[PDB]
Amino acid sequence: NFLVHSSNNFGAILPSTNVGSNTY
Amino acid sequence: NFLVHSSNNFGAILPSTNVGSNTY
Amino acid sequence: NFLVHSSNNFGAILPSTNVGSNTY
Amino acid sequence: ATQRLANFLVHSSNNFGAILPSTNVGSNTY
Amino acid sequence: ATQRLANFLVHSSNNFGAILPSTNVGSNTY
Amino acid sequence: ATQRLANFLVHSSNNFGAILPSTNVGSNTY
Amino acid sequence: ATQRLANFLVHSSNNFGAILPSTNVGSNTY
Amino acid sequence: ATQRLANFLVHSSNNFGAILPSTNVGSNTY
Amino acid sequence: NFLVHSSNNFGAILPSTNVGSNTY
Amino acid sequence: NFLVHSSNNFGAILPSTNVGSNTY
């Protein structure tokens, strides 16, 4: 029934992430 | 029934994030 | 039934965020 | 520490390119 | 510490490019 | 510390590019 | 430390390119 | 440390290119 | 039924934010 | 019944991420 163009992406060319410490 | 252009992205060329510490 | 241009993005070229500490 | 989380509902009828990044607990950067 | 969270509803009828980043607890940067 | 949060409703009929970033508890920067 | 997490619902009726990266606990970058 | 996680539901009716990377605990980069 | 141009973005070229401490 | 173009990808040319330590 459904007629969809369904095109999705992500932009990440250089993630660089230093979370550290978490407590929950 | 539905006719959609459904194009979504993210912008992130250089994330650099230092969360630290969390308590919840 | 629905005819939508549905284009969404984010702007983040250099996030750099140091949360610290939270209590909830 | 500890946690107590319950009964989370994210219902949406229709979002025409509506940005609702309704993120619960966690550390992401994409 | 601790937490007690319940009964969260994000209902939307129609959002024509409405920005509702209704984010609950967590650390994100995108 | 602690928390007690309940019964949160974000209902919108129609938003023509209305900016309602109705964010509950959490640390974001986008 | 410890954790207590329950009753998480992410229901969506219809999302026309709606961005809802509703991520629970964890460390991702994509 | 320890963990206690239960009752996680990710139900979606229809997502027209909706991005819901609802990732629970773990370390991924893709 | 609905015919919308639905283009939305964010402006953030250099966030740098040091929350500190919160109690709720 | 359903007629969909269903094309999805990820953008990651150089992830480099140093998580550190987590407690849950």
Swiss-Prot record, chains A, B, C, I, J:
GO CC terms of this entry: extracellular region; extracellular space; neuronal cell body
GO molecular function terms noted in the UniProt entry: amyloid-beta binding; hormone activity; identical protein binding; lipid binding; receptor ligand activity; signaling receptor binding
PTM notes: Amyloid fibrils are degraded by insulin-degrading enzyme IDE.
Keywords: Amidation, Amyloid, Cleavage on pair of basic residues, Disulfide bond, Hormone, Secreted, Signal
Coarse class of the protein's main subcellular location: secreted
Record GO biological process: amylin receptor 1 signaling pathway; amylin receptor 2 signaling pathway; amylin receptor 3 signaling pathway; amylin receptor signaling pathway; apoptotic process; bone resorption; cell-cell signaling; eating behavior
Protein location: Secreted
Superkingdom of source: Eukaryota
In-chain residues carrying the UniProt-annotated modification Tyrosine amide: 24
Notes concerning its domains: The mature protein is largely unstructured in the absence of a cognate ligand, and has a strong tendency to form fibrillar aggregates. Homodimerization may be the first step of amyloid formation.
Miscellaneous comment: IAPP is the peptide subunit of amyloid found in pancreatic islets of type 2 diabetic patients and in insulinomas.
Family as reported in the entry's similarity comment: Belongs to the calcitonin family.
Function recorded in the entry: Amylin/IAPP is a glucoregulatory peptide hormone that plays an important role in the regulation of energy homeostasis. Selectively inhibits insulin-stimulated glucose utilization and glycogen deposition in muscle, while not affecting adipocyte glucose metabolism. IAPP function is mediated by the CALCR-RAMPs (AMYRs) receptor complexes. Amylin can also bind CALCR receptor in the absence of RAMPs, although it is more selective for AMYRs.
Assembly notes: Can form homodimers. Interacts with IDE and INS. Interaction with INS inhibits homodimerization and fibril formation.
Protein name in UniProt: Islet amyloid polypeptide
The encoding gene: IAPP
Included range, full protein: 47 to 70 of 89
